Structures are given as structure tokens and as C-alpha cells.
Design a protein around this ligand. Structure first.
Ligand SMILES: [Zn+2]
Ligand SMILES: [Zn+2]
Lengths: 197, 239, 494, 96, 552
């Protein structure tokens, strides 16, 4: 029956929601269900053909004030349901992509639809437009854990050689350790090169 | 689950003897096994050399370090973690078959049933190793278990391919196991180093009629014939 | 002369009412349009040539007859004698038989032209430029030649002898006799008894050498006394230069000891029993001294050039200890003696002890240092001699000139045959059948992913073997400086 | 008290011994060589090292073990083949 | 620009405050020195002198986002920013030739219903010798890819979305109507048969009615309707047809508009290149703008070792030197005999003779200045060319045939300004037109092997040819046991997004310039025929095809 593929798709939605919600990291979101979506869209096209057939046959006039009213209303509701299921799935994966944008890309691509890939590009362009405009003195893409300590120990987890910072350098020797201003290394903690606190 | 280990009658499998003479078990109890493996000493010298090097590496104590390296490399997991993982898979997941998996399994069932039928005709007796609708459920359970490893809530085409492959590798391989005039006719009429295209041999033998493929299987096991070119050319390769 | 044979065959064919497969425009026979299409049988027919040449390595204290053979192909065509789809047309074959008999009778009546013609037939049955060339005819003649050589070996062995080696030009035969002077009569009896069988009526059976004592592992690696001693070893060529004279010295010492033992045993009356005892202790003392010297000098720039291992055609493998390579070579040559395996084996153990290598250690095992690259059925037109030539195991003089006569082979002709062999093997790789990897059934269908017995499909020519073939081709091309072949090899990758 | 270790093992020799024993054991009625016999060579070599109270198995122990197992195999064969088989196996055992 | 007034320790805070603080890009020291001298060699004055400093650093950072060269700066990366600044349309940037061996390989995934990129492992470096050789796995996947592409193309056609049942579904479904899609086998037992990835079935054609616009050779993918009968395990065929071809636009838009050529960009395993719509339109407008460009195609079987050929050709090239082509396709068997290993040393050897012919040809090209410096030569081998001839002896052989070897090109390569010795299924990627070229004499093979069913001519037997080729979607419909394919390179013979034009050259059929599904297929069948030299002028900016002849 016409609601079923929508239910399969939103059960998929719920499972990917749980997959994302169980962990602190961004779990790489699962494959876009192109096949179920195409089955739904074909089902919607069939329901559209049924409305077309019926609105043709209202010229022929069979009991239309009730019977055609009922057939039309039911198939219309089937289409509303299928729209709701499709938009619920797409809105969840949109929400997760927005989260990933702010977490990393605004500072696994095969699993997205091409609309979702170019959407993620445009949304990263938007985040960068915000932190590049007014309010620029705040790195709007930065962390939301409050700054507890200004100086921190950090252990170098992967090697990256000599890099400059605002008034000096760090030579990121493997398994060396710094005592350093947190604001001068936060980018490297996010990028996974530095370990502690 | 029942995991059982047994030797054939006569202890060693005795390959030239009929399987119905080698196998003690009745077809009733045999049918209750999803997979029946018939295990044989291949006696291949390269294999035996390999096994010898391996077993020496066991007894020397090299293998104690090798297993630890394999576990830390992530190519192997330990008893403890695997025990917990089997428990977790048995409690989280219990997958269904997709419709596509179901059709492939159904057609595979009729295929293996046809193979057993023609083998029972060729050997003019009911087979000791059976294929029954219970054994379709064996392939179903194996499909589901293969999906149950990765906690996939449904089994898919790939899992069915592996389940079919395992059943073919085990129970079918257990089941799988006047011509004297026709073989010497072929030896007379196809001399060394030349090719008879198969269909012409079929027409000639029919024109004299299933003895053909027995003759080809025998002569192909021997060095005398080689089925070249997609099986189209019967090539008198050997003596 | 192939063209004269073409027209003269065309006459007798049309006179026997055969439709004529003369082709003017292309080498392939004009069968109508079908000749233009690839076919697995046709491609097998064109690609295939190798004789199943027999090589029973060993030591032979019996006298060995080095029987040359010639006119083998002519003999098969004369003495020879739808369901079969790569047999040449039996009508055309009967015409070629009767016509060859006619030419041969006129050669026996000393027609220089008919004699020259029958000599040149071996070219025409192979030459693609022959107007009546047919790959089926070439193959029919070739596999009949193969069967005839096997029957000739059957005939000699049926007369109580035993074959050391056999190919399309040569047979070496163990006699079950011990003295050459005793056997100059029996050998001629034996050869006459073969030729008087009708199957071999036309053969040029010729006793080219008498070997009193023979050490043999292949025709490029043998030594013996002839009735006087000769030694030739492709083995030797891979030892570093300090050790090549050392190898020849100990080979002469081995021959001397074997001969002393043979003549001793015969004065006292498989005769080789105990031959190791005449030189084993000197050899061990020598090897110990050489091992000390190698430790002194292998690293030394004064001497290292004599320890550097030679790069060569078909140079199979890397080696770490060149003295060990000499010892492996000597021990392998001596281990050819089936009668005396134990005494050699114990000596080999006592030698490898110098290196502290264990008796069966994988390093101490002898693998042949040379990889064969045989171009089958090369033609010396100057004397119509058909020979397989091995660009690695043969010496350079035997590559750039004929062995029987000594006219030089043309360089570009030679390189063209190597490129033809190379492309034949690449095609044979791409046109191969696949075989099931655990039950050896052939893949008959076109779109299965695996065999019904659950076995994965694998090649009948595994890719590794063809990688190895291209490697020896690049080695041969670099060594002899074959610019055309080397640029062909370059154009494969690039 | 004594638990001899294998060391410096002539892996290629035991491998060739087992491979040849397996090949010649294809004779349908012969003593059925199996992987537990390969492990038996090692048990016997260890027992010989035990007799010496030696915590390492020497080459002499292993060679005596090979001699026992090969002779036990050869001795079980019918006279029609026993000379040929003993001659063939002699390279592994009469070197000791 | 003024002399440099910068040092990296002084410029360091500003470089950080832009690249790191805004965008997270890390200031590795060597890249900082290169960045500092780049800034100094453009600004000159010291970093403190106005917003141009931060504007320049911002421009660097934006170009860094364009080149995506990682989380740390480096001197090579600064050089990339410089080159992208030098880039801050010319048709030569887009016209290129793709040999069979240089084409981006794509495998077709059936489950994902889309293409995926595969690296050409000649790139891997370990393929320095025997990199070119396929793997056995390629052989088992060869026909599967053809089927999956055909099946996917079928499902997109409106007539089917009755529907295909895979052949394995038939077994036991006795006495019932089905539609199949399958590879037309002849079983080893001799019977005609169809095969599918799921299995195969023997067929009876004795009551069938094929559709008439097609050839039906073995190995052709055929849609088949019939009744399955389990009693003989037969499938009795009602009717048979080739699966409908798909127009180029429909294929491209429904596969996701990939660049399968590198006409816009090269692909990686992490990055499938996209055929950008705006650039496609810009190129299309330029393509319509270039009224004057003309591709000249010579006929096949241009034997350089016949004086009559060379005389005719001298006359033709003398015409072309008056007004040079944009491009000039030579093709097909440049020697009368196939050139194979000689049997004798008396005559000048076969290989040497072939070399002499390209010397003679280079002598001709020397006389024609405008041609030699304004055209692009393309050479396309045929059955008589050099390394294929070695093993085939002039028959058909391993089909994605290699270009004629570089040991024999040398004098030609010296005299000509531009040449491409290309594979037999070569491709030209013109501005928007993918143009396949193929030299095969197909029509003889089709008529020689077509299935003979129980139960004007020159136009009909070429409509049949192109409809067969394009509905089959693949230049070699025949089984590999009748035309072997290099297993790795079978993707080059596939036409799945149907080309914009095809020079389907064939010496055993009439000349033509048909159109089918928007694909313009032309055939300048033979160079010397009926005492005329024959050549053909395809005009890309209008798709006209003016045939031309010289009497001789
Ligand atoms: Zn000669
Ligand atoms: Zn198999």
C-alpha cells in the first residue's frame, strides 16, 4: 500500500539518527537511499496518473460529488504522506550535514546525493561568509566548551615540522610536549595533531 | 547448534568406493546438517611442504609471537573478544532476506535439486547425501548468519552469493561424487594433436545416447583429452 | 624454390579436382571471407610449435650413440598412413604424398632440380609467403613430425637401447654396451635395423659421435670422452670470473676419476661406484682454502672484479656467496650419477659444513641459473635446417650463426622472430581459457562469476609466468642490443 | 624436570622427509602417513633430547628421530618395493 | 615594483592573523619564506603599507582554497598560487585525442547503478614492464559489464518502464511467457542459447519473428520474448530484437553528467570529474563559432607500398596544402601485405620494408608546408600494421589495437608539426563532440556470422549496420572467441554515452553519412575504389559531411 515505502524510509531515518546520536564524534552518515527514494517518486508519479485519470473522468461524471471526491482525497493524502516521509529523511540528513559543516568543514563523500554534496558546499560557503563579515573578531566556527585554562600542556601526537605562529614557532616533533597558550594551538587540537586537554 | 566430527566407514575415505558404502549415517540424520564437509588428505606435495613448515613453526614456539602480531595488526581477534562479539550479535540482530535474496535462493534450490536428480539417474540410485527443502532452510540460515556478522538488519545479494558458495563447497561437494566401446571409437577416430568440435561428436554418437559425457569425463580426468576453447574443442592432447 | 613448389602443387591439385587455396594478396589461405576472422583453433594452429623433446639427465658409462637425423619431415609425409576440424584436407595430403614420392624418385635418379626441390620442401610447408600456404597444412605436417620422432624413439628403445635425449635433429642413445671398438659393428647393425622398418625408410640416420663416458643434464650442459674429452657448461658462465677456471679444473678431475673407475672396474671384470674417493679429500681441502681466500678478498677492490657475478641473458637469480654457487654447481653435476647418489650426497654434506649450511637448507639447493627463451623452428635457408634456438642457454656463436653450416643469421630476421614469439605469447595470454582453481573444469560459459563447485576461476597461463617471459625478453634485448625488440618492449608499457 | 626446546631446526629436512613419506605412502595399503606422524618426529626428537637431560634438541636427536620414523615406515612395506623405497629414503637417514 | 623591504619574522604575525586565525591554514616555514618573497616581489614596500598586504594575503588564502593543497603551506604550494595567478577560450585547450590505453577507466556498479573510476595501473610505477597486462579478474568481469550497461539502458526505455526476468528466474516456472535480456551464445553442445549474469538457457528460434532493422550475430545482447518449457529445458522464442539505443543527452543526464574523457577535468578515485554545464555551453557556442574548421578523413586500406596509391595521395595532399584541414585522419593497413616475421634474409626484411614506406610518406609530406604546420595528423592502424600483423598475419585480432610502433614513426614525426599515432578505437574529444573513430570492416563480419532464422539494398545494409552498432551500444558485439578483446581495455569499445559522431570506417560497405539517435555515423569506406581516390570532409561546426573524390 502507498504508505509503506515512506515507512521504510523513515525507519531508515530513525536508525541513522541513532547512529549519529550515540557518539561524540561526527559519525560518517550512511548511504543515501536512492533506491527507496526512486520507488517512492515512481509511486508518487503513479498517484499523479491516478489523479489525472480521475480528473479526466469527472467529465464522464460517475458519482463524482462523493465517489470522485473520495478517490481524489485518498490519493491526495497518500501523496501528502509520501512527501512527509521524503522530507523527514532529507531534513534529518540535512541537519547532520549542517552539524558536520560547523564541526569541521566551516573551520565518505560518496554517501551524499549530488544535491547534498553541492548543498554542503553552499552551506560551508555560508558559514565562511558569516565569520568573514561583521562579527569577524569572534571565530564563529570555534568551540562551544568554555575556555577553562589559558595555558595548557599539549603532547605532539603526529609530526608536522616547523610552523610559525603569531610571534614564534612550534616544531611539531613526534612525542614532544609543549606548555603553551591554548588559543595558539586550538586549530591543531581540532585537526588532530595535539593530544592533551 | 550441533557441530559433529566423524570418520567414514573404512576410516580413510576410500575414494574409488561408492559414497553409499563409505558413509555410515542414514539419510535422515544427514539431512539435519546444514553443511556436510567431506575432508580428504589431498597428498599434494606443495601443500604437504607448506603444512610441514607451518606445523614446525607451531612446535618451535614461533607461532606464539606470530598470533600476537596478527592480533595487534588487527588481522585477527582473540578468544575473549570474539566470545563477547558472538554474544552481542546473537542478542542485537536477527536479519530478514530482501526480495532479491529470496528469488536468488529459490532459483538456486531448484538448480541444486536438478543436479541431484540427474546424478541419481546417472548412478541409478537414490543419493546418500540428500538435498531437501530443509536444506533450502540451511542456505537461508547461512545467509542470515552472514548478514548477522556485520549486524546488517537485512541480508542482501552478496550474503546470498557467499551462502550459496559455502553450501556448494560443502554439501553439494559431498553429493557431487558400452562407454568402453565409445571411448575407443573416439580414440580411433581422433588421433593425437587434433580437435573434434564437441557437437559433431554428439551428432556422430547419437547417429549410431548419454554415454558421451561419461566418456568425456573419464578421458578428461586422464591426460589423453583436454577440453579446449570454452569446452567447444575436444583436443586429443595426451596419449 | 617454394614458389616453384607452389605452382607445381597447384597443377596436381586441380588435376585431382580440388578447389585451390592460392592466395595472392595475403599469407593466409583464401578460404573465402572466413580466413579474415579470428578463430581459437586457427590461432592455436598458428601460435603452437614445440617438440616434446626428451632429456633424461644422468651419467652413462655405456657407450652412447650421438645419432643425427635429417629428412624427418620428408619421411613423415612419404610414410604417412568431417570428424576432425583442424586436420588438413586428406585429398590435398594424398596429392602432396604422391607428388613428393615422384620428386623423390627423380632425385634418386639424380635430377639436381628435383633433389633441390625435395630438400626445399621443409621450408615451403612452413613459409607463410608460399602461395599455397595453409596453417592447417603446416600443423598437420608438424604434429606428424612429432609423432614420427616419438615412434623413432620407440623403435630404438624396442631394440633394447635407451634414449638419453631426443629432438627433431638429434638423438643420444644408451647402448647397453661398454667399448667403442667393440661396437663400431653393432651400431651400424642397430641403425640399419631402424631404417629397414618402413616407417623410417627415408631417414638420414648418421652416427655423428661415439661417447665413451657421458655426463649430461641438457645439450648446453654436458661433458664426456669421445672416440678425446670435451666439456661445455652454461652452468660455468654464471660463476664469478675467479671460479670459472676452478669449475673446469674440477670437471676434468671428475671425468678423470670416473674414467679411472670405469677402466678399473672393467679390468676387474653403474661401474662408477666409489669414484668420489679418488678426489673428495683434495676437493674439500681446496674448497676450505678458497673459502678463506674469499673472506680475505671478496670486499677488496684489488680482486672484487673476479668475484662480481656476470649479468647474462636469462640470468635467473640473485646470489650472495659465489663460492657456494660453484659448490652447488659441482655437487649438482656429480648428483646426476644415479648409481652413486649416496657417496656424492655425503660429500655434499661435508662441503656445505664449511659454510655451516644445513644439508637440506633452501639456500644450498641447486636451481638452474638460466631461463630458457626458445624461438621454435628457426630456418637456416642456406642449408634448409630447422632448429629451435635458445637465446639464453645457447652460446652467442650458436645464436648469430647456424650450427650445422656456419652462415650468419640476419640480425633483423632474428629480432623479428623474437617479436613474433613475444606477441604470440601476449595473444596466447589474452585468448586463454580459464580453469576452475579446485576442480580443473574449463570455463564454458561467458558470464559466470565462479565455477558451480564454488571454485574461483583462474588462468591456464597464470599472469606471473607471462611477467617472467617479458622479463627474460627485456634481458635478452638489453644484452644482445636488439634495438627493435627493445623498442617493442618499450611500446608495451608506454 | 626436562622439557627440550626445538631450535636451529632443519625445517627443510623434516619437510622433505614428511613430503616424501606422504608421497610414497600413497600406496593404498601402506602405513597411513598423516600430520600426526609429522608431529611424531618432533616428539621423538624431544624424547631423545630428554634422554640426554638436554633442554635443547640437537641435530643428533632429530636425525635419530628421522631414522626411527623412516625405518618404521620402510619396515612396514612389502618386499616388492621395500628395497627401492629404502634406497630412495637413504639420503635422509644414512647421512647420519 | 620597489625593492623588497620584508623579512619573514616581521611578516609572520600578519600571515598568521590572516591564514591561520581566519582559515586554519598552517604557516610551515619554507612556505612562509616563499610567501614572504612572493608578497615582496609584488608589493615591494613593507608589510605595514596599507590594506594591500592583507588583500594580498587574502588572495593567497582564497587561491589556496581553490587548489586544496592541504593544511600546511609549502613552497610548492606558493608556486601553485603563482601559477593560478598567471591563469587569472582557446580551442586547443579542449581539442585532444584519447588513445585506448590513455582513457580513464570506469567500472559500472550495478547495485549503485552508476560508474566508478579505476586508476590505470601503468601510473602505479610497478607496471614499468607488464603493467599493461590484464588480470584474470578483468576477464571474468568483461561480459558482465557489457550486460549491466545494456540492462540499465533497457530499464530507462519507456516501453519497459512488461519487464525483464533474469534467465535464472525461469527454472521450474514451466509453460509461461517471459521477456529475457541475454548474450546470444552458441552452447558447446551446439544449440543456440542466451546467457545472463544469473544463468543461461537454450532457445528454439524455429517459430520466431525478429524485427527487421538489425543484425543478430553471436554475442549480441538481444531482448527476447518467449515461452519457457521445462520438459526439454527450452525457451521457445516468439520474437527477438536488439535493446533500444539511448540518445547521448539522455544517457549523460541519467548517469549523472560525468566527464568520461577529461575534456573538462581528470578524475581520481575520491573525485569523479563532472561535465560542468556552463563550460559545456561556452564550448558549444565556440564550436558553433568556428565555421572554418574541417576534419578530412582519408579512406581505408591506404597501402603506402603501391605507387598508384601514392600518386593519388600526392594529388589529394596538393589540394589540401591550398587550404589546410584542421585535422587529417589517415587510416587503415598502411601496407598491402600484412607485415610479419620474414622467412628469408635475401629480400629486404618485412619490418625494414614497412619503415621504408613511412620514409617515402615523410618524403611526400615534406613538399606540403601549410599542411604539415597547420593540421593535426592522426594515424589509425588496421589489420596489416606492424605488431598486430606479427601474430594475426593480417586477419582480425586483439581489438583495442596498439598504435603503430615508435621505431617506424621517426621520419614522419620529424617532418610533421603535430601527429598522434593512436589505437584503432581511438577517440577525438572535440569541444563538446565526443567523436569515436574505428577501422574494422564490420559489415562483412556481420553478414558472414548473422543468425539465419527459419520461418535500395545498399541503403538497407548500412541502416542495419549503424542500428546494430548503436542499439548494441558497443563497437564489437561479437564473442571474444570471434574477436578477442584486451580485457582491461574493453571499456574503450563501449559507447555507453553514445558519441556525437562516429567515423565507423569499413572497407566492405558503401560510403554513407547516416544519423541515428542524434549520432552522425560516417564511413569513407575505401581510399581507392572504382578508379577514384575517395576521402571525406566532416565539418564539426555544422555536422555536414561533404564526400570528395579525385579520378585516378
Ligand atoms: Zn645452416
Ligand atoms: Zn570447479
Amino acid at each position: 500500500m502507498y504508505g509503506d515505502l515512506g515507512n521504510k524510509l523513515v525507519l531508515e531515518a530513525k536508525r541513522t539518527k541513532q547512529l549519529y546520536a550515540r557518539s561524540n564524534q561526527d559519525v560518517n552518515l550512511p548511504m543515501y537511499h536512492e533506491d527507496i527514494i526512486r520507488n517512492i517518486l515512481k509511486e508518487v508519479s503513479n498517484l499523479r496518473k491516478n489523479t489525472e485519470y480521475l480528473k479526466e473522468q469527472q467529465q464522464l461524471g460517475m458519482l463524482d460529488d462523493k465517489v470522485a471526491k473520495c478517490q481524489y482525497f485518498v490519493t491526495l493524502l497518500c501523496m501528502e504522506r509520501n512527501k512527509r516521509c521524503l522530507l523527514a529523511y532529507q531534513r534529518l540528513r540535512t541537519d547532520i550535514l549542517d552539524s558536520m559543516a560547523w564541526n569541521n568543514n566551516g573551520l565518505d563523500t560518496n554517501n551524499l546525493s549530488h544535491q547534498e554534496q553541492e548543498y554542503l558546499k553552499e552551506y560551508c560557503d555560508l558559514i565562511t561568509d558569516l565569520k568573514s563579515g561583521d562579527l569577524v573578531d569572534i571565530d564563529l566556527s570555534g568551540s562551544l566548551v568554555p575556555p577553562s585554562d589559558v595555558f595548557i600542556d599539549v603532547r605532539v601526537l603526529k609530526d608536522a615540522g616547523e610552523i610559525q605562529t603569531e610571534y614564534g614557532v612550534f616544531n611539531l616533533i613526534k612525542d614532544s610536549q609543549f606548555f603553551v597558550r591554548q588559543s595558539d594551538v586550538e586549530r591543531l587540537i581540532q585537526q588532530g595533531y595535539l593530544q592533551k586537554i | 547448534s550441533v557441530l559433529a566430527a566423524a570418520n567414514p566407514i573404512y576410516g580413510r575415505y576410500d575414494d574409488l568406493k561408492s559414497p553409499g558404502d563409505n558413509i555410515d549415517f542414514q539419510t535422515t540424520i544427514l539431512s539435519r546438517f546444514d553443511m556436510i564437509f567431506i575432508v580428504k588428505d589431498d597428498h599434494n606435495e606443495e601443500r604437504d611442504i607448506s603444512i610441514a613448515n607451518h606445523v614446525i613453526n607451531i612446535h618451535t614456539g614461533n607461532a606464539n609471537a606470530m598470533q600476537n602480531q596478527q592480533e595487534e595488526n588487527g588481522s585477527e581477534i582473540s578468544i575473549e573478544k570474539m566470545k563477547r562479539y558472538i554474544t552481542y550479535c546473537r542478542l542485537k540482530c536477527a536479519p530478514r532476506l530482501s526480495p532479491q535474496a529470496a528469488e536468488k535462493l529459490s532459483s538456486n534450490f531448484v538448480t541444486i535439486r536438478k543436479q541431484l536428480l540427474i546424478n541419481e539417474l546417472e548412478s541409478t540410485e537414490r543419493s546418500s547425501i540428500p538435498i531437501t527443502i530443509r536444506q533450502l532452510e540451511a542456505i537461508i540460515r547461512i545467509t542470515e548468519s552472514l548478514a548477522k556478522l556485520e549486524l546488517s538488519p537485512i541480508a542482501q545479494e552478496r550474503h546470498v552469493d557467499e551462502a550459496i558458495r559455502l553450501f556448494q563447497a560443502s554439501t553439494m561437494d559431498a553429493a557431487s561424487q558400452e562407454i568402453r566401446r565409445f571411448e575407443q571409437e573416439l580414440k580411433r577416430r581422433l588421433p593425437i594433436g587434433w580437435s573434434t568440435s564437441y557437437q559433431t561428436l554428439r551428432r556422430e554418437f547419437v547417429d549410431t545416447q548419454l554415454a558421451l559425457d561419461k566418456a568425456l569425463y573419464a578421458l578428461e580426468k586422464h591426460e589423453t583429452i583436454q577440453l579446449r576453447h570454452q569446452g567447444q574443442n575436444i583436443y586429443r592432447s595426451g596419449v | 624454390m617454394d614458389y616453384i613448389i607452389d605452382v607445381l602443387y597447384a597443377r596436381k591439385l586441380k588435376k585431382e579436382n580440388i578447389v585451390l587455396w592460392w592466395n595472392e594478396k595475403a599469407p593466409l589461405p583464401d578460404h573465402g571471407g572466413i580466413q579474415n576472422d579470428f578463430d581459437l583453433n586457427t590461432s592455436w594452429i598458428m601460435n603452437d610449435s614445440e617438440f616434446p623433446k626428451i632429456n633424461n639427465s644422468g651419467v652413462y658409462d655405456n657407450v652412447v650413440l650421438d645419432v643425427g637425423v635429417d629428412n624427418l619431415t620428408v619421411n613423415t609425409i612419404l610414410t604417412s598412413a568431417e570428424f576432425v576440424h583442424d586436420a588438413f584436407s586428406n585429398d590435398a595430403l594424398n596429392v602432396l604424398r604422391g607428388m613428393l614420392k615422384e620428386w623423390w624418385d627423380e632425385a634418386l635418379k639424380e635430377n639436381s632440380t628435383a633433389d633441390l626441390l625435395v630438400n626445399s620442401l621443409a621450408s615451403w610447408v612452413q613459409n607463410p609467403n608460399a602461395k599455397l600456404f595453409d596453417g592447417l597444412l603446416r600443423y598437420h605436417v608438424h604434429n606428424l613430425t612429432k609423432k614420427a620422432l616419438l615412434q623413432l624413439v620407440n623403435e630404438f628403445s624396442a631394440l633394447g637401447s635407451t634414449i638419453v635425449y631426443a629432438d627433431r635433429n638429434q638423438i643420444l642413445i644408451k647402448t647397453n654396451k661398454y667399448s667403442p671398438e667393440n661396437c663400431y659393428a653393432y651400431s651400424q647393425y642397430m641403425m640399419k635395423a631402424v631404417r629397414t622398418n618402413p616407417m623410417f625408410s627415408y631417414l638420414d640416420l648418421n652416427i655423428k659421435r661415439y661417447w665413451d663416458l657421458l655426463i649430461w643434464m641438457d645439450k648446453f650442459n654436458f661433458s664426456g670422452l669421445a672416440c678425446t674429452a670435451v666439456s661445455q657448461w652454461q652452468l660455468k658462465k654464471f660463476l664469478s670470473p675467479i671460479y670459472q677456471p676452478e669449475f673446469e679444473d674440477w670437471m676434468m678431475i671428475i671425468l678423470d676419476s670416473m674414467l679411472k673407475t670405469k677402466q678399473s672396474y672393467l679390468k676387474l671384470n653403474n661401474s662408477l661406484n666409489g669414484f668420489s674417493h679418488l678426489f673428495s679429500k683434495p676437493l674439500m681441502k681446496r674448497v676450505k682454502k678458497l673459502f678463506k681466500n674469499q673472506q680475505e678478498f671478496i670486499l677488496d677492490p684489488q680482486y672484487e672484479a673476479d668475484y662480481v657475478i656476470p649479468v647474462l641473458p636469462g640470468s635467473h637469480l640473485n646470489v650472495k656467496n659465489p663460492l657456494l654457487e660453484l659448490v652447488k654447481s659441482l655437487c649438482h653435476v656429480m648428483l646426476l650419477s644415479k648409481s652413486t647418489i649416496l657417496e656424492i650426497r655425503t660429500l655434499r654434506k661435508e662441503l656445505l659444513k664449511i659454510f655451516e649450511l644445513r644439508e637440506f637448507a633452501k639456500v644450498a639447493e641447486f636451481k638452474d641459473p638460466s631461463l630458457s627463451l626458445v624461438v621454435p623452428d628457426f630456418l637456416c635457408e642456406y642449408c634448409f635446417f630447422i632448429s629451435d634456438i635458445d637465446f639464453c642457454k645457447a652460446a652467442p656463436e650458436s645464436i648469430f650463426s647456424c650450427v650445422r653450416c656456419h652462415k650468419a643469421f640476419n640480425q633483423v630476421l632474428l629480432q623479428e622472430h623474437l617479436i613474433q614469439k613475444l606477441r604470440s605469447d601476449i595473444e596466447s595470454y589474452l585468448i586463454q581459457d580459464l580453469r576452475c582453481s579446485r576442480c580443473h573444469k574449463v570455463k564454458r560459459d561467458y558470464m559466470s562469476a565462479h565455477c558451480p563447485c564454488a571454485g574461483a576461476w583462474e588462468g591456464t597461463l597464470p599472469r606471473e609466468s607471462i611477467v617472467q617471459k617479458l622479463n627474460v625478453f627485456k634481458q635478452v634485448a638489453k644484452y644482445y642490443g636488439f634495438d627493435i625488440l627493445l623498442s617493442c618492449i618499450a611500446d608495451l608499457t608506454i | 624436570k626436562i622439557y627440550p626446546k626445538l631450535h636451529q631446526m632443519d625445517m627443510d629436512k623434516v619437510s622433505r622427509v614428511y613430503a616424501d613419506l606422504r608421497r610414497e605412502s600413497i600406496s593404498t595399503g601402506s602405513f597411513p602417513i598423516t600430520v600426526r606422524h609429522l608431529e611424531s618426529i618432533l616428539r621423538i626428537a624431544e624424547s631423545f633430547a630428554k634422554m640426554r637431560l638436554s633442554e635443547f634438541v640437537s641435530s643428533y636427536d632429530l636425525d635419530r628421530a628421522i631414522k626411527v620414523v623412516v625405518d618404521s615406515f620402510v619396515d612396514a612395506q612389502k618386499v616388492s618395493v621395500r628395497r627401492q623405497l629404502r634406497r630412495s629414503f637413504a639420503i635422509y637417514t644414512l647421512g647420519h | 615594483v620597489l625593492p623588497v623591504k620584508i623579512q619573514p619574522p616581521l611578516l609572520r604575525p600578519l600571515a598568521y592573523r590572516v591564514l591561520s586565525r581566519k582559515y586554519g591554514l598552517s604557516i610551515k616555514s619554507d612556505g612562509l619564506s616563499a610567501l614572504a618573497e612572493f608578497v615582496g616581489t609584488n608589493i615591494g614596500a613593507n608589510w605595514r603599507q596599507g590594506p594591500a598586504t592583507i588583500k594580498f594575503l587574502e588572495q593567497f588564502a582564497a587561491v589556496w582554497k581553490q587548489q586544496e593543497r592541504g593544511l600546511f603551506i609549502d613552497q610548492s604550494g606558493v608556486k601553485e598560487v603563482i601559477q593560478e595567478m598567471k591563469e587569472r577560450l582557446d580551442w586547443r585547450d579542449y581539442f585532444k585525442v584519447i588513445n585506448a590505453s590513455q582513457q580513464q577507466r570506469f567500472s559500472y556498479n550495478p547495485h549503485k547503478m552508476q560508474f566508478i573510476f579505476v586508476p590505470n595501473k601503468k601510473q602505479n610505477g610497478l607496471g614499468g614492464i607488464a603493467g599493461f597486462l590484464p588480470d584474470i579478474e578483468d576477464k571474468v568481469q568483461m561480459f558482465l559489464t557489457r550486460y549491466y550497461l545494456t540492462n540499465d539502458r533497457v530499464m530507462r526505455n519507456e516501453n519497459f518502464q512488461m519487464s525483464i526476468t533474469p534467465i535464472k528466474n525461469l527454472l521450474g516456472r514451466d509453460a509461461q511467457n517471459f521477456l529475457l535480456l541475454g548474450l546470444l551464445n552458441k552452447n558447446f553442445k551446439g544449440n543456440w542459447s542466451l546467457e545472463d549474469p544469473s544463468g543461461s538457457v537454450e532457445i528454439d528460434i524455429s517459430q520466431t519473428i525478429p524485427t527487421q532493422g538489425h543484425y543478430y550475430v553471436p554475442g549480441c545482447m538481444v531482448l527476447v520474448e518467449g515461452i519457457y518449457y521445462s520438459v526439454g529445458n527450452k525457451f521457445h522464442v516468439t520474437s527477438m530484437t536488439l535493446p533500444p539505443g539511448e540518445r547521448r543527452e539522455i544517457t549523460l543526464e541519467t548517469i549523472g553528467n560525468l566527464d568520461l574523457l577529461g575534456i573538462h577535468g581528470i578524475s581520481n578515485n575520491n573525485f569523479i570529474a563532472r561535465l560542468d554545464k556552463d563550460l559545456k555551453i561556452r564550448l558549444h557556442l565556440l564550436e558553433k563559432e568556428l565555421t572554418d574548421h574541417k576534419f578530412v578523413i582519408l579512406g581505408a586500406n591506404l597501402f603506402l607500398d603501391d605507387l598508384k596509391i601514392m600518386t593519388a595521395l600526392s594529388k589529394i595532399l596538393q589540394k589540401l596544402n591550398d587550404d589546410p584541414p584542421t585535422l587529417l585522419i589517415w587510416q587503415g593497413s598502411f601496407t598491402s601485405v600484412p607485415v610479419f616475421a620474414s622467412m628469408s634474409s635475401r629480400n629486404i626484411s618485412s619490418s625494414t620494408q614497412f619503415k621504408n614506406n613511412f620514409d617515402a610518406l615523410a618524403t611526400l609530406l615534406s613538399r606540403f608546408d601549410n599542411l604539415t604546420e597547420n593540421t593535426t595528423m592522426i594515424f589509425i592502424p588496421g589489420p596489416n600494421d606492424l605488431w598486430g600483423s606479427m601474430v594475426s598475419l593480417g586477419a582480425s585480432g586483439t581489438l583495442p589495437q596498439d598504435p603503430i610502433p615508435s621505431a617506424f614513426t621517426k621520419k614522419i614525426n620529424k617532418v610533421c608539426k603535430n601527429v598522434v599515432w593512436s589505437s584503432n578505437p581511438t577517440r577525438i574529444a572535440y569541444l563538446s563532440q565526443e567523436i569515436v573513430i574505428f577501422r574494422d570492416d564490420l559489415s562483412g563480419r556481420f553478414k558472414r556470422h548473422r543468425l539465419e532464422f527459419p520461418f535500395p539494398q545498399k541503403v538497407q545494409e548500412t541502416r542495419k549496420l549503424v542500428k546494430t552498432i548503436l542499439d548494441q551500444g558497443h563497437l564489437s558485439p561479437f564473442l571474444d572467441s570471434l574477436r578477442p578483446i584486451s580485457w582491461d581495455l574493453d571499456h574503450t569499445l563501449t559507447l555507453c554515452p553514445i558519441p556525437s559522431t562516429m567515423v565507423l570506417c569499413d572497407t566492405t560497405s558503401a560510403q554513407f553519412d547516416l544519423t541515428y539517435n542524434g549520432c552522425k555515423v560516417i564511413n569513407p569506406g575505401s581510399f581507392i575504389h572504382n578508379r577514384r581516390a575517395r576521402y571525406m570532409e566532416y565539418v564539426p561546426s555544422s555536422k555536414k559531411t561533404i564526400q570528395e573524390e579525385i579520378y585516378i
